[PDB]
Amino acid sequence: MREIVHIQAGQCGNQIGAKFWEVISDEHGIDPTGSYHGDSDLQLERINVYYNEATGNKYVPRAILVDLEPGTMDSVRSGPFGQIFRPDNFVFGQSGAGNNWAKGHYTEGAELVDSVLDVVRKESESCDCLQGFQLTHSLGGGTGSGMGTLLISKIREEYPDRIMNTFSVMPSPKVSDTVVEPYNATLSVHQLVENTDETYCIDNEALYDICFRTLKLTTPTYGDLNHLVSATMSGVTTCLRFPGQLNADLRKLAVNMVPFPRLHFFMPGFAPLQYRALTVPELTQQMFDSKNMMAACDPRHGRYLTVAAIFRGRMSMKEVDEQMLNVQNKNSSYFVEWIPNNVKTAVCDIPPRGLKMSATFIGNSTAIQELFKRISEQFTAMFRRKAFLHWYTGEGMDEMEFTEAESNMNDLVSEYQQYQDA
Amino acid sequence: EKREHEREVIQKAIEENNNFIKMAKEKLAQKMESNKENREAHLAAMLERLQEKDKHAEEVRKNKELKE
Ligand SMILES: Nc1nc2c(ncn2[C@@H]2O[C@H](COP(=O)(O)OP(=O)(O)O)[C@@H](O)[C@H]2O)c(=O)[nH]1
Ligand SMILES: COc1ccc([C@H]2[C@@H](C)C(=O)N2c2cc(OC)c(OC)c(OC)c2)cc1O
Ligand SMILES: [Ca+2]
Ligand SMILES: [Mg+2]
């Protein structure tokens, strides 16, 4: 029954994970009680990808909530859909991780990982056919980043032939907690290159800009940013959650979106960001405008290796293809020619809450290298003076592991550059 | 290989917290030892000087007696 196990870790990871569940629970007609009151069965046909059934026939998210301190999870619990989650599925320590990758990966997080793997095992073992795992986290803190990557390693060890998928929030000076964010992210990306099959790169720089230069929010809160993230995450998982002419699953996705095993970092796109529904031509233009991208790279600086796009709502499948095909055949400079038919299009009838038309885009572009450069430059600006490193050497790390993580990110960048020029 | 690296990092952090504690403990004990020594030697030298002055005051009374 192609079940997915969802894991959310750290402050960011749990905040956006929680919103995610709010949104999709509403789309599937589940209320804060886990009770179904929807009007279709398109809501229920694949409900088991994300939800386990209850004794009274209630639906309970296949979700595991993880943190090294309890604050955020207390908030999640006391939030709107807080009580939907399995309470055994809250796994947390007391001490925190101090925005320190080393504490999440090596010291504090090591002490909690096994209890997390216990809840994971308990959720996997009752899966008819488990697809893989979905992790929500940021890369700039300590828990979601250090402990999140540690977790991905353990899961890969225990389930080496399942798919690992992340939604990974990338740090930016614009919207920043601490200065060590580049260190934590460079260390984390290195893990993600070896141990995931698909990673959605969600850049906080982009979310800030869309919030500021577009949504016209002058002082954008984390709730504002998370609302974009929530919409993107719902769009990006539509084809898994709903029945269509496609059977979408994680493995087929990875096979069709990843031509080289290391280049599996995707730029998501969304449209629109209202009483006038958009027309298919507007969806198409907006989706592919840099301004609707959530990774803060401009797609005209690179080339698309692959693209997956869904349109949500009742519209003209013919007009979609016409428009899709049109934007390709207007912009062939920005798609690779050596991968025939590298743009794929689908349609769902059910739109999301509050829109009668929407469109979501998953792009594997070489322009994502811009993001990794941005991080590399920042990492190097400190590391060349070994600034701030004592926080990590004090947990047992050596400079060597840093130099290697740096190196592997720059190699990743070189790889993206090689294919942008082929 | 990765698990064993994980073990190494955390054992190194323990080892360093320990060597730091140890070093501190020793540094303290050496300084307090050297301190007591020095302080004592200063008092002892003071008392020695005083006691020589006592002895000298005998040789001044014993010597007045030897003019008779
Ligand atoms: N978009 C988004 N980013 C967040 C949120 N919370 C924290 N961040 C970012 O995540 C990074 C800090 O990590 P955080 O999740 O707070 O630390 P953790 O508890 O150790 O995992 C920084 O880059 C913040 O900008 C959130 O709710 N939404
Ligand atoms: C060539 O690129 C493709 C990219 C994606 C797919 C399908 C199939 C692998 C699947 O699953 N895809 C998928 C999944 C999607 O989400 C899971 C999705 O949009 C959300 C989507 O939009 C076209 C396509 C088929 C393709 O031929
Ligand atoms: Ca501890
Ligand atoms: Mg934080």
Side-chain angles (χ1 to χ4, degrees), chain A residues 48-275 277-355:
Chain A
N48 50 287
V49 177
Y50 282 102
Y51 295 78
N52 279 323
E53 254 174 278
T55 32
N57 186 33
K58 292 198 178 75
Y59 297 97
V60 170
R62 201 170 297 103
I64 303 164
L65 295 81
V66 173
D67 211 345
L68 277 173
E69 81 192 11
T72 309
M73 284 166 59
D74 286 325
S75 284
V76 156
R77 212 182 264 138
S78 294
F81 279 69
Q83 278 154 311
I84 199 181
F85 301 102
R86 229 163 150 294
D88 307 311
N89 285 23
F90 291 68
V91 193
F92 57 97
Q94 292 294 327
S95 60
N99 295 290
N100 191 318
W101 194 85
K103 300 192 178 181
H105 205 69
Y106 283 142
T107 56
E108 302 298 321
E111 184 174 356
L112 190 68
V113 66
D114 286 348
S115 340
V116 179
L117 296 169
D118 288 342
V119 181
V120 173
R121 205 167 293 108
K122 208 180 307 151
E123 281 293 0
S124 289
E125 273 168 1
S126 83
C127 286
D128 167 38
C129 187
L130 149 94
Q131 273 187 65
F133 308 86
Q134 195 178 270
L135 165 69
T136 58
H137 70 135
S138 74
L139 305 191
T143 307
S145 203
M147 200 187 167
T149 48
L150 185 72
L151 254 170
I152 279 171
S153 219
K154 309 287 188 186
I155 283 166
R156 197 187 177 173
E157 182 182 62
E158 190 174 345
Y159 311 81
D161 62 347
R162 299 313 143 113
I163 292 290
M164 172 59 75
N165 176 71
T166 69
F167 299 82
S168 294
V169 183
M170 314 274 170
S172 177
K174 277 189 201 176
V175 40
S176 181
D177 290 354
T178 78
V179 283
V180 289
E181 287 176 359
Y183 282 157
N184 302 334
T186 296
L187 296 161
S188 237
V189 154
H190 184 193
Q191 303 292 311
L192 291 183
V193 179
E194 313 295 344
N195 293 325
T196 76
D197 298 310
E198 303 131 341
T199 285
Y200 302 105
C201 307
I202 288 157
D203 184 329
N204 256 3
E205 195 148 305
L207 305 179
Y208 188 80
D209 296 350
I210 294 167
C211 266
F212 159 45
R213 303 181 184 149
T214 283
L215 253 272
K216 295 309 165 195
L217 303 179
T218 8
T219 87
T221 48
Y222 275 120
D224 292 332
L225 269 54
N226 296 352
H227 171 260
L228 305 180
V229 182
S230 229
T232 303
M233 290 181 53
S234 166
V236 136
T237 51
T238 292
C239 295
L240 308 164
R241 281 193 288 115
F242 289 112
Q245 216 175 309
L246 52 48
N247 222 85
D249 70 54
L250 300 176
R251 183 170 278 111
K252 276 170 179 168
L253 185 69
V255 173
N256 296 295
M257 291 298 290
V258 187
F260 311 97
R262 280 161 55 90
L263 314 187
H264 53 265
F265 295 89
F266 306 152
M267 280 171 33
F270 191 94
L273 318 157
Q274 68 292 327
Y275 305 115
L278 256 33
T279 68
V280 173
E282 311 186 289
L283 288 203
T284 288
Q285 143 57 249
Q286 274 154 65
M287 226 175 41
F288 275 95
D289 206 317
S290 338
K291 295 163 221 177
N292 295 66
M293 310 277 76
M294 290 184 192
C297 315
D298 162 51
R300 281 158 272 248
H301 301 287
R303 304 176 105 207
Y304 285 113
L305 297 173
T306 37
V307 173
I310 15 113
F311 289 78
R312 295 194 71 180
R314 281 144 81 264
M315 78 206 75
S316 157
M317 325 192 59
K318 189 165 96 62
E319 194 171 19
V320 182
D321 285 324
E322 293 195 29
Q323 281 302 311
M324 278 325 277
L325 309 168
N326 158 46
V327 94
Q328 301 218 46
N329 320 318
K330 148 138 69 185
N331 299 322
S332 275
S333 166
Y334 303 116
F335 294 81
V336 298
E337 70 278 22
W338 40 269
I339 303 188
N341 317 129
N342 59 342
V343 189
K344 181 78 193 284
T345 297
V347 178
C348 192
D349 305 322
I350 325 190
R353 192 121 204 212
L355 299 161

Side-chain angles (χ1 to χ4, degrees), chain A residues 105-106 153-154 157 191 393 395-396 401, chain B residues 2-3 5-6 8-10 12-13 16:
Chain A
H105 205 69
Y106 283 142
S153 219
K154 309 287 188 186
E157 182 182 62
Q191 303 292 311
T393 56
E395 303 294 310
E401 192 166 349
Chain B
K2 212 219 176 285
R3 338 278 66 167
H5 173 73
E6 296 162 12
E8 269 153 45
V9 170
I10 189 177
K12 181 152 167 299
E16 282 179 333

